[PDB]
């Protein structure tokens, strides 16, 4: 059958076991599928570098605020310098407006990096 039989056991894994202890399953699925699509999109050395750093930290459990900060710290100066490929502009809009918002999703003073505050 040629329909959805190939759709079984997604590479972008989704569970609520001991990654932290709990989490958001649907929003993590939504973001990590979009970022997996964003790797399959044509990205240059620097944009690839940020999203490869993203994979290794995501699966090392180095935190959702920390990695939302990481993409907003890595992609915002490249946006201002006008060299981001911009073909995942919706991902940049996503971590500021979807459920995760402005700062990250929780707020708080990060210190040091206040170029856009």
Task: Walk me through the structure.
The chain has helices at residues 25-40, 45-58, 64-74, 76-80, 89-94. With 117 residues, it is mainly α. It has one domain (1-117). Helix 2 (45-58) packs antiparallel against helix 3 (64-74). The chain is globular. It is classed as immune system.
Task: Assign a percent range to the helix content.
Answer: 40-55%
Radius of gyration: 15 Å
Main structural class: mainly alpha
Beta-strand level of the residues, as a percent range?
under 5%
Envelope shape: globular
Tell me the number of strands: 0
Q: How many discrete structural domains?
A: 1
Sequence of secondary-structure elements: HHHHH
Counting DSSP H or I runs of 4 or more residues, the number of helices is: 5
SSE layout and pairing:
Blueprint: H1 25-40, H2 45-58, H3 64-74, H4 76-80, H5 89-94
Helix pairs in contact: 2-3
Key features of this structure:
plasmid; 117 residues; 0% strand; mainly alpha; LciA_Immunity-like; monomer; Lactococcin-A immunity protein; bacteriocin immunity
Short summary:
The chain is mainly α and 117 residues long. Helix content is 44%, strand content 0%. It is built from five helices and no strands.
